[model samples]
Target: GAMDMSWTDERVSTLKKLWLDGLSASQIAKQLGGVTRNAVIGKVHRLGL
Candidate 1:
């Protein structure tokens, strides 16, 4: 929550897809832009996905 970066719909959707598609947290981070791996993990946690 401290990153201050906004997770747009497309970004979140892509992350969801990637996660469901069996991509690792680091992989999701690499696929994501303007965000870090920790952010990806945090979002996944927050979403409980």
Candidate 2:
């Protein structure tokens, strides 16, 4: 099966929550599976959060 790194709406929601909650990109990557530290950082940047 594919790794399924695509971020769904719910996943984005969780990312926003965790981001505002002060979770680091590295930690967010750990908490949210299927994504890497750089992935989290890039997403956060794109989200402009």
Candidate 3:
């Protein structure tokens, strides 16, 4: 099954912030609630970030 995209907006926002803030993937993952590093990577990759 495909994952829900509803959370993408928030996830993408968090990702951009973390990326702009110079946070590593692991760091972003840790900071994001209910999301793992792999999920962050997937979201970034999907968003072409």
lDDT of each: 0.89, 0.90, 0.76
lDDT string for model 1 (10-46, tens) is 8899999999999998999888867888889999999
Stretches of candidate 3 above 4 Å error? 1-8
Model 1 residue runs over 4 Å out of place are 1-4
lDDT of 1: 0.89
Relative to the true structure, candidate 1 has a C-alpha RMSD (angstroms) of 2.8
In model 1, state the lDDT of residue 21.
99
lDDT of candidate 1 at residue 16, scale 0 to 100: 97
lDDT of 2 by residue, 1-49 (tens): 8875889998899899999999999888898888998989899999998
Using lDDT as the measure, the top candidate is: 2
Q: How close is every model to the real structure, measured as TM-score? A: 0.82, 0.86, 0.67
Better of 1 and 2 by lDDT: 2
Best candidate, TM-score-wise?
2
Q: How close to the true structure is residue 26 of candidate 2, measured as C-alpha lDDT?
A: 86
Locate the minimum summed-lDDT window of 10 residues in model 2. 1-10
Model 2, which residues run further than 4 Å from truth? 1-4
- lDDT over C-alpha atoms for residue 34 of model 2: 82
